[PDB]
mmCIF file of N, CA and C in Angstrom:
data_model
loop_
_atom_site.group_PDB
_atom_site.id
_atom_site.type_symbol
_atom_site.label_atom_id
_atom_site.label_comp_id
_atom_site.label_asym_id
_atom_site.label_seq_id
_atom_site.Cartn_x
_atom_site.Cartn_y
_atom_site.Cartn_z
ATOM 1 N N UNK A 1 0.827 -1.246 0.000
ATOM 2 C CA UNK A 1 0.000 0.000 0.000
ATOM 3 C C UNK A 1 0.849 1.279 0.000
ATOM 4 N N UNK A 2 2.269 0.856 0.737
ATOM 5 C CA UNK A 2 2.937 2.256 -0.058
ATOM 6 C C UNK A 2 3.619 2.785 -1.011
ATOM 7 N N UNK A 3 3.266 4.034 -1.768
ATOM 8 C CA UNK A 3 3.747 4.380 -3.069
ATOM 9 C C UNK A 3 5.360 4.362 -2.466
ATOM 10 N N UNK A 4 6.056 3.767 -3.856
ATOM 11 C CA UNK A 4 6.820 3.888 -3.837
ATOM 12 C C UNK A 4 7.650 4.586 -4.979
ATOM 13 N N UNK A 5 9.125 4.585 -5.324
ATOM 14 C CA UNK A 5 9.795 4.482 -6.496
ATOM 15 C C UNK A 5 9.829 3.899 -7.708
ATOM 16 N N UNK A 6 9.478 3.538 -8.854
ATOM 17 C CA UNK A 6 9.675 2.728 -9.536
ATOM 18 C C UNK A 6 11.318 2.388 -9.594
ATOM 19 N N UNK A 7 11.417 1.484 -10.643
ATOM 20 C CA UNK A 7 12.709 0.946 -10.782
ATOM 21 C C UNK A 7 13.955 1.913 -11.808
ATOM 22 N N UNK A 8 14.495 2.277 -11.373
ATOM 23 C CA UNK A 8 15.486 2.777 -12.164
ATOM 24 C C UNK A 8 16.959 1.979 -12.888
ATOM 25 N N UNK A 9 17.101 2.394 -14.241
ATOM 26 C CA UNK A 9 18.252 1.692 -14.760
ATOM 27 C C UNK A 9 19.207 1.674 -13.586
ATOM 28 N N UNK A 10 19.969 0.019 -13.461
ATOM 29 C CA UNK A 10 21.015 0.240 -12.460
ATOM 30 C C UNK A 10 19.953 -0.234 -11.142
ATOM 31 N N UNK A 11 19.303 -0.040 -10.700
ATOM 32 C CA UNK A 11 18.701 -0.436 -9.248
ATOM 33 C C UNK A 11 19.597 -2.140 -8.869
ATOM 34 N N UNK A 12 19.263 -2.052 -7.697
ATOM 35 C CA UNK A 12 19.163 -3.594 -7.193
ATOM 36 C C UNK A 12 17.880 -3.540 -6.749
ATOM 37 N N UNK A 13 17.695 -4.959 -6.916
ATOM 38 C CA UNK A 13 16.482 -5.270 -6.997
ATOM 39 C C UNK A 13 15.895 -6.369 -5.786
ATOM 40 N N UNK A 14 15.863 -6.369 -4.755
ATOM 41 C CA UNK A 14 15.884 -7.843 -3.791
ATOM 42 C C UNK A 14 14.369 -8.270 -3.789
ATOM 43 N N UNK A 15 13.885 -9.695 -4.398
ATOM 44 C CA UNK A 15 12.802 -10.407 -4.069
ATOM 45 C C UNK A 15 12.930 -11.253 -2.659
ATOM 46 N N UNK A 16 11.786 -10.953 -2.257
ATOM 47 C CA UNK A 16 11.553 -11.591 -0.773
ATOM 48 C C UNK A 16 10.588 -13.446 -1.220
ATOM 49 N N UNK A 17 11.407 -14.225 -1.122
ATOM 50 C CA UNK A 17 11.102 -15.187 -1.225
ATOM 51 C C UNK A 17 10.614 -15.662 -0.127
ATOM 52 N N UNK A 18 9.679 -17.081 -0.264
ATOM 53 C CA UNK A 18 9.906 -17.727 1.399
ATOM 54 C C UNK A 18 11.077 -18.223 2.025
ATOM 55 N N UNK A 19 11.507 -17.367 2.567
ATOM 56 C CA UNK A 19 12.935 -17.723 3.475
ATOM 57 C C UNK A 19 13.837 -17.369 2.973
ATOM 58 N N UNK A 20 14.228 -16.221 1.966
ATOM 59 C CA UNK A 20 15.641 -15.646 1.594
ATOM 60 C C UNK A 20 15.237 -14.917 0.601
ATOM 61 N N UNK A 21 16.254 -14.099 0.409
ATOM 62 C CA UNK A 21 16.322 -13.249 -0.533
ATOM 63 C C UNK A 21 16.535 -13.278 -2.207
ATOM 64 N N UNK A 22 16.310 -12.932 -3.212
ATOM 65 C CA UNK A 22 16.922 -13.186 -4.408
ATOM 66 C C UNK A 22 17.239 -11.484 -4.725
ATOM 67 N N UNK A 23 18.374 -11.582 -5.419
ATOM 68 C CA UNK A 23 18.642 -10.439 -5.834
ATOM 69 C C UNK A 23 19.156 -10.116 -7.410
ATOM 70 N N UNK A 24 18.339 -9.404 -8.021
ATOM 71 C CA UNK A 24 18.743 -9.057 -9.451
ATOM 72 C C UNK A 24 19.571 -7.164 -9.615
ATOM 73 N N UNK A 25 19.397 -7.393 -11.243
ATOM 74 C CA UNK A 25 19.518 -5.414 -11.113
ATOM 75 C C UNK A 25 18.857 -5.220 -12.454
ATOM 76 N N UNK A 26 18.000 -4.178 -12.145
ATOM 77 C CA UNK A 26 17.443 -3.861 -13.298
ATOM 78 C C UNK A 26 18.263 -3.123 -14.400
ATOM 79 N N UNK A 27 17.853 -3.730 -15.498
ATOM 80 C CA UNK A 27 18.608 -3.142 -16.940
ATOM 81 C C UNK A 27 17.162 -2.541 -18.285
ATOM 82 N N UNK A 28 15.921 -1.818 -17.345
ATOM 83 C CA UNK A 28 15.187 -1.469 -18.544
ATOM 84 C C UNK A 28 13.961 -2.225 -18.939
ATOM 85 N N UNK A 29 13.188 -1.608 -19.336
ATOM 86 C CA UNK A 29 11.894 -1.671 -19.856
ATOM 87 C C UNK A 29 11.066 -3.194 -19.349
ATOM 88 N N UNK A 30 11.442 -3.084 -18.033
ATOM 89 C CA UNK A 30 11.045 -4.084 -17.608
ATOM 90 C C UNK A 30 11.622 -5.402 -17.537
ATOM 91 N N UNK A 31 12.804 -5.014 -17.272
ATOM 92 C CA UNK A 31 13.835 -6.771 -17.285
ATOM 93 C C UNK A 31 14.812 -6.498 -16.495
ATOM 94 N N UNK A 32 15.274 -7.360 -15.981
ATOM 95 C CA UNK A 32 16.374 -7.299 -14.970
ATOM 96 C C UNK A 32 17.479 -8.646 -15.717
ATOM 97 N N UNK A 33 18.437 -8.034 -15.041
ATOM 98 C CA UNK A 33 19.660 -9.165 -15.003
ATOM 99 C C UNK A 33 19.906 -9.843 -13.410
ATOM 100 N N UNK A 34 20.205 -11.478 -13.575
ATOM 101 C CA UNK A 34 20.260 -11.947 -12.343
ATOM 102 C C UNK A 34 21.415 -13.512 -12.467
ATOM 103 N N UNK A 35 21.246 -14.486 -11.546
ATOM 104 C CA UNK A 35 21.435 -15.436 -11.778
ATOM 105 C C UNK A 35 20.635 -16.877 -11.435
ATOM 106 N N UNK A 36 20.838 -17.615 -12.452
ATOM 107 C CA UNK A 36 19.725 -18.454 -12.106
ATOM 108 C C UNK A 36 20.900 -20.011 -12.292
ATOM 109 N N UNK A 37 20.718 -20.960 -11.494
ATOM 110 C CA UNK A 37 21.494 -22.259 -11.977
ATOM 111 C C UNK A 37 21.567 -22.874 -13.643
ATOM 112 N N UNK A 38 22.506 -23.275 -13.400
ATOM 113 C CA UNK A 38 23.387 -23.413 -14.867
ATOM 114 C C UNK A 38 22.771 -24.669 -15.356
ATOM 115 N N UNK A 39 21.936 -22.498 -4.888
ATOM 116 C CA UNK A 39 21.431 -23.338 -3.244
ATOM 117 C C UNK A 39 23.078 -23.344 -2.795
ATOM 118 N N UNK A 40 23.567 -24.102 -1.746
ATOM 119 C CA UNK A 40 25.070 -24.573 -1.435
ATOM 120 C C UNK A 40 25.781 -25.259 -2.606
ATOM 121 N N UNK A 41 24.739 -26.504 -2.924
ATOM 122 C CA UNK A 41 24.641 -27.342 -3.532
ATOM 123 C C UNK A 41 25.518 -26.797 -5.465
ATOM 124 N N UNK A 42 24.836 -25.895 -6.147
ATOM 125 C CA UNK A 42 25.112 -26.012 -7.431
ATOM 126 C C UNK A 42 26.329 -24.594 -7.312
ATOM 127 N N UNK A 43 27.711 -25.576 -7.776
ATOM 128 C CA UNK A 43 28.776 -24.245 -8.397
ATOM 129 C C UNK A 43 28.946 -23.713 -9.697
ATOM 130 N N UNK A 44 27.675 -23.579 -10.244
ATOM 131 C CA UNK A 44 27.616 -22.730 -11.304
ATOM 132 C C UNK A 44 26.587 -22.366 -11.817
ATOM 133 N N UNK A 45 26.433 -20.595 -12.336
ATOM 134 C CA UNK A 45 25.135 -20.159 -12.216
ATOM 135 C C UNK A 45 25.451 -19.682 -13.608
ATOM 136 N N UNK A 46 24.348 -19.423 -14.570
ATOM 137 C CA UNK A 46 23.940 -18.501 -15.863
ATOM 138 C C UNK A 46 23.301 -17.071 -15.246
ATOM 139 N N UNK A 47 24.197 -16.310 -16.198
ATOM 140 C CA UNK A 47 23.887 -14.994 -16.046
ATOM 141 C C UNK A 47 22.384 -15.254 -17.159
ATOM 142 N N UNK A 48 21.125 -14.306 -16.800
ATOM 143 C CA UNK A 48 19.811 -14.378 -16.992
ATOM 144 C C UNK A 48 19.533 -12.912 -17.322
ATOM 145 N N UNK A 49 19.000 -12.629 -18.442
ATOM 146 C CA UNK A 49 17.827 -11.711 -18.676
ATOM 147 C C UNK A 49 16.578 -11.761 -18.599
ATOM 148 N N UNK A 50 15.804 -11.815 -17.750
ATOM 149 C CA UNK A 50 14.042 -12.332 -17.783
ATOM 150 C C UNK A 50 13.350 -10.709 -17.580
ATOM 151 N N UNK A 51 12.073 -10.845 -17.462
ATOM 152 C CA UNK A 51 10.957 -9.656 -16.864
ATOM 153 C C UNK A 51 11.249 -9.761 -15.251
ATOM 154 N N UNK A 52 11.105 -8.521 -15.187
ATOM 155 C CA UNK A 52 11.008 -8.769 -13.168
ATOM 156 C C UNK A 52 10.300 -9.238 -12.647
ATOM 157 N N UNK A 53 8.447 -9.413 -13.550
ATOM 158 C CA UNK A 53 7.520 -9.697 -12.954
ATOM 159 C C UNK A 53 7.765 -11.329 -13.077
ATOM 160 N N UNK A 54 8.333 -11.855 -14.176
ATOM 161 C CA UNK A 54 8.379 -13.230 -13.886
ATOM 162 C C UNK A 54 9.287 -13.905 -12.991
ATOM 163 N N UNK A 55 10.434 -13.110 -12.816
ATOM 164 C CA UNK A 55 11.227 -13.698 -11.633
ATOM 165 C C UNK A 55 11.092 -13.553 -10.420
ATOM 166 N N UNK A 56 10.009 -12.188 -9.951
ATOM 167 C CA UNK A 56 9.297 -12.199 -8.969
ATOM 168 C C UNK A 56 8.301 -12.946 -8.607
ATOM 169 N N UNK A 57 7.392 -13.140 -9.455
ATOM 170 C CA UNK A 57 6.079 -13.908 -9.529
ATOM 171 C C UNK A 57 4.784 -13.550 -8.608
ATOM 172 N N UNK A 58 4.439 -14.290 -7.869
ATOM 173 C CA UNK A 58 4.043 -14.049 -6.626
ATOM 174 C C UNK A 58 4.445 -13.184 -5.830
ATOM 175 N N UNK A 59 5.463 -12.708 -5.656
ATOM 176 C CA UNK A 59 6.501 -12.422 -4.403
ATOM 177 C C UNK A 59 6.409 -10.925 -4.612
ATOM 178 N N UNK A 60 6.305 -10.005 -3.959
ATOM 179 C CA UNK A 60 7.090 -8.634 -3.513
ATOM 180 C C UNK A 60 8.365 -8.674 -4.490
ATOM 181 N N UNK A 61 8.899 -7.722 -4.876
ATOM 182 C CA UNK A 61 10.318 -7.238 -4.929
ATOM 183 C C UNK A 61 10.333 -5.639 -4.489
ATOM 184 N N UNK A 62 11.769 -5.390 -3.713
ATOM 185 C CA UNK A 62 11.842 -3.594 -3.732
ATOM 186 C C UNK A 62 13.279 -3.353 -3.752
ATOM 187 N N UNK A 63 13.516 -2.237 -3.968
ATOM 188 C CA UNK A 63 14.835 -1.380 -4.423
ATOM 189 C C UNK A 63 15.509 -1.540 -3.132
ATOM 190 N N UNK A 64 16.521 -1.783 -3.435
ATOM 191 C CA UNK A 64 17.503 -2.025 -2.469
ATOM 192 C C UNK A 64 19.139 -1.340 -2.700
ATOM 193 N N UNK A 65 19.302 -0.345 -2.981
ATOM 194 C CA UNK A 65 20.498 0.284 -3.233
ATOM 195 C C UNK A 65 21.628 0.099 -2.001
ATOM 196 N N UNK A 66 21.809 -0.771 -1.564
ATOM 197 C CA UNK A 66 22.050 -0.810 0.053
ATOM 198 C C UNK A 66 23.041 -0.049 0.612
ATOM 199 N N UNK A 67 24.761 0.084 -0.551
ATOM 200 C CA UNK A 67 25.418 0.520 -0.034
ATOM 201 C C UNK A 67 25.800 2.198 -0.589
ATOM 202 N N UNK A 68 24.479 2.606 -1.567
ATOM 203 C CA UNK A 68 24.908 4.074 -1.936
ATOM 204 C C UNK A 68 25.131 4.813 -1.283
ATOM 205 N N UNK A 69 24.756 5.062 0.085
ATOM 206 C CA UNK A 69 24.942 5.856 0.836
ATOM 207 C C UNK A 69 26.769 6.030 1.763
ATOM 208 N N UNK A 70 27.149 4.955 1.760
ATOM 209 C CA UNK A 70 28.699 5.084 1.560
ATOM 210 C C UNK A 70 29.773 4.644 0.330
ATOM 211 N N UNK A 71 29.012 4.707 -0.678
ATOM 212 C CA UNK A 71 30.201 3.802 -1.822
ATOM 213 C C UNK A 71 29.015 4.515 -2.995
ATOM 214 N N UNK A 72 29.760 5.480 -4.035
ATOM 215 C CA UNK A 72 29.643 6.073 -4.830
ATOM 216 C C UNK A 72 28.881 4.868 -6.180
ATOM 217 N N UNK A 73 27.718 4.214 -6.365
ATOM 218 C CA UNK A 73 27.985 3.606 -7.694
ATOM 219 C C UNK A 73 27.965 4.160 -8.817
ATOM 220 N N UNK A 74 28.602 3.120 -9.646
ATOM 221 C CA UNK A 74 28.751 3.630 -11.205
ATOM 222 C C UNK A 74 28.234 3.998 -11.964
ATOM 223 N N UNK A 75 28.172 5.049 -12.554
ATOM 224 C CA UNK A 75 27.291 5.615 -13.840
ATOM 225 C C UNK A 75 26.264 4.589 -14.306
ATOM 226 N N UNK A 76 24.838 4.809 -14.788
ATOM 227 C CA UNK A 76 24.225 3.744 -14.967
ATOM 228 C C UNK A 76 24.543 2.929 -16.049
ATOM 229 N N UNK A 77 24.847 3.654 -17.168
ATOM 230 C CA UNK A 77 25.395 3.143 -18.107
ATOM 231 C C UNK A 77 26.457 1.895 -18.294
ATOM 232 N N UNK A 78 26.791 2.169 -17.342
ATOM 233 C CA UNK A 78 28.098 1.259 -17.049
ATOM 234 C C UNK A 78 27.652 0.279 -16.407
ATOM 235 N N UNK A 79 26.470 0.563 -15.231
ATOM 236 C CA UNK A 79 26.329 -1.004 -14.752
ATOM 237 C C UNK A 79 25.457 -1.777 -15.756
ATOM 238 N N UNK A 80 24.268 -1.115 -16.375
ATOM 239 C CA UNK A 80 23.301 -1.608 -17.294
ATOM 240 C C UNK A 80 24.852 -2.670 -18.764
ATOM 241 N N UNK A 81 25.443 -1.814 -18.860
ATOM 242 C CA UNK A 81 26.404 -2.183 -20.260
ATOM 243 C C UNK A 81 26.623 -4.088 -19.902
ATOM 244 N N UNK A 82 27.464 -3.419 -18.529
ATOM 245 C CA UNK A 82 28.411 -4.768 -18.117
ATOM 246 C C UNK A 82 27.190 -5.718 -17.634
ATOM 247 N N UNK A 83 25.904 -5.761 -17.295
ATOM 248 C CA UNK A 83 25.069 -6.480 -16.584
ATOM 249 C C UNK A 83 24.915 -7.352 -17.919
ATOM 250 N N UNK A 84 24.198 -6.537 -19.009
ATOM 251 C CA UNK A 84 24.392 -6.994 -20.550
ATOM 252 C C UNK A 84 24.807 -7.571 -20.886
ATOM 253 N N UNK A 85 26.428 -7.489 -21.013
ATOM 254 C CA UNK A 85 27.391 -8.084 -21.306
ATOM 255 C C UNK A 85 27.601 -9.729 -20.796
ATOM 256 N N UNK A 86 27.155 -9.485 -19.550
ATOM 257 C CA UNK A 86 27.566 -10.797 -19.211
ATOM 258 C C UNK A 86 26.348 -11.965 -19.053
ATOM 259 N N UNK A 87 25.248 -11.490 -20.102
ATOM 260 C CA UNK A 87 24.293 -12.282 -20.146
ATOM 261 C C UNK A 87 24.588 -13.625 -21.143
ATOM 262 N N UNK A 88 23.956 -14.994 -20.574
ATOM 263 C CA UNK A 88 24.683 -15.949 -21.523
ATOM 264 C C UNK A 88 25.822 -16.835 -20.262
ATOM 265 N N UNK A 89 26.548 -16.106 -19.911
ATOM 266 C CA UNK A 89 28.093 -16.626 -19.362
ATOM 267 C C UNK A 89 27.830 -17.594 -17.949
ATOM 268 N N UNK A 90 28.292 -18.339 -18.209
ATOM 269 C CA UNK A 90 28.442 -19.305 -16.285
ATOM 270 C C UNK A 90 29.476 -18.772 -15.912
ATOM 271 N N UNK A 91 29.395 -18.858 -14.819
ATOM 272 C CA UNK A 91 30.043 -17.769 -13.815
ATOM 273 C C UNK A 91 30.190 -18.976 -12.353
ATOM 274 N N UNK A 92 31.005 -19.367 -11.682
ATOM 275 C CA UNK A 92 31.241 -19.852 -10.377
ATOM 276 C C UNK A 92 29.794 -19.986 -9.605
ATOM 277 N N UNK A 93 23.335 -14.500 -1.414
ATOM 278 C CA UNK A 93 25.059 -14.099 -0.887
ATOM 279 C C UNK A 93 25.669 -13.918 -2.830
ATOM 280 N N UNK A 94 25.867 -15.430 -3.107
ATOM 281 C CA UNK A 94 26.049 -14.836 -4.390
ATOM 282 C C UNK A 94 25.594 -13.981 -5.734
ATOM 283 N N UNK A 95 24.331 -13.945 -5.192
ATOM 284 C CA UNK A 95 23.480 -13.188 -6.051
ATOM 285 C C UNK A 95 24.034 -11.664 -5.837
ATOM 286 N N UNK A 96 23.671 -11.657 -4.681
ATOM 287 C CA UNK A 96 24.185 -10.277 -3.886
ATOM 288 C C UNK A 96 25.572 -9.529 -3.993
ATOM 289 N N UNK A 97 26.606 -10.666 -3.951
ATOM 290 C CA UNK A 97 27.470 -10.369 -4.788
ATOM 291 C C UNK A 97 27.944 -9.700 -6.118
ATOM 292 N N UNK A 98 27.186 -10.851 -7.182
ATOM 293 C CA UNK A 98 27.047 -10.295 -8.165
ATOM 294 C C UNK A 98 26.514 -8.864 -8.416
ATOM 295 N N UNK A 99 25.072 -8.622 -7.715
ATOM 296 C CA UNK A 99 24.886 -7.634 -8.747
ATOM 297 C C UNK A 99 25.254 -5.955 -7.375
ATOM 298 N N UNK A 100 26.033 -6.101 -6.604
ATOM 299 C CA UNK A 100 27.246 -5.346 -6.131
ATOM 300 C C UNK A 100 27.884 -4.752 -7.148
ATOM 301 N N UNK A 101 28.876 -6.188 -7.524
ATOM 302 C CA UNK A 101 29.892 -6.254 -8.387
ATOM 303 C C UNK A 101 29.825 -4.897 -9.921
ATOM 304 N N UNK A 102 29.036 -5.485 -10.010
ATOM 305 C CA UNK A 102 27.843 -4.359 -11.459
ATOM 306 C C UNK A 102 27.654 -3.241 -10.743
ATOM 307 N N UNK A 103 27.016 -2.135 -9.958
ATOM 308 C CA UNK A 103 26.425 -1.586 -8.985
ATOM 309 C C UNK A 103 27.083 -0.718 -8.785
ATOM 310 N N UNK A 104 28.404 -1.468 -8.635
ATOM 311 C CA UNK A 104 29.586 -0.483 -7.614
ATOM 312 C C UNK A 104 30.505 -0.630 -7.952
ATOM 313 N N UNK A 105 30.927 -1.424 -8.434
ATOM 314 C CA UNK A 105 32.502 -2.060 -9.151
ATOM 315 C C UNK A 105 33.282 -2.775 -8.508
ATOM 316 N N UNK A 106 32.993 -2.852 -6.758
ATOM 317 C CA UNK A 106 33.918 -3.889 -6.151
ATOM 318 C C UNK A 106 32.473 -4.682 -5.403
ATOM 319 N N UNK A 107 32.805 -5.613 -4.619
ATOM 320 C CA UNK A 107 31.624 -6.465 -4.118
ATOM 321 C C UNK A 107 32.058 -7.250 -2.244
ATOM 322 N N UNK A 108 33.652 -6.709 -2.321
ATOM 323 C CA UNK A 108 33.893 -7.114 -1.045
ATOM 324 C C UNK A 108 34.317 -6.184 0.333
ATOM 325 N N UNK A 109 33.702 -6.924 1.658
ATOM 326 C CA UNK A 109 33.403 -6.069 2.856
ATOM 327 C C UNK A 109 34.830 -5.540 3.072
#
């Protein structure tokens, strides 16, 4: 019930699942970049372009910029480019990682 922000190029994006978080970043007209398996269990994920509404589904999602307020992120351009870029690719909390990584340019505490 409360208005909020819509999504801006560059956002993070955190869906509230039952019992954890998923985290994407939006790249535009309604799609986000994320990762989806290629748990503890699986070491390797595909970078994903889907709709937000389908990777949300059911679920809530909201903007989560977490660390702008001390760590400058990158031009949007730049995170939208590289989020792009690495759609397609297997790649090795980690979600969260990732779309840091994009966001801000580094991803560690």
């Amino acid at each position: 019930a409360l208005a909020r922000p819509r999504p801006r190029l560059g956002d993070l994006i955190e869906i509230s699942r039952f019992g954890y978080a998923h985290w994407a970043i939006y790249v535009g007209d309604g799609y986000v970049v994320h990762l989806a398996p290629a748990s503890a269990l699986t070491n390797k994920a595909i970078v994903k372009k889907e709709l937000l509404s389908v990777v949300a589904g059911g679920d809530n999602y909201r903007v989560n910029n977490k660390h702008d307020d001390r760590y400058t992120p990158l031009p949007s351009n730049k995170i939208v480019k590289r989020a792009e870029e690495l759609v397609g690719q297997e790649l090795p909390d980690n979600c969260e990682h990732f779309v840091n990584h994009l966001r801000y340019g580094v991803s560690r505490s």
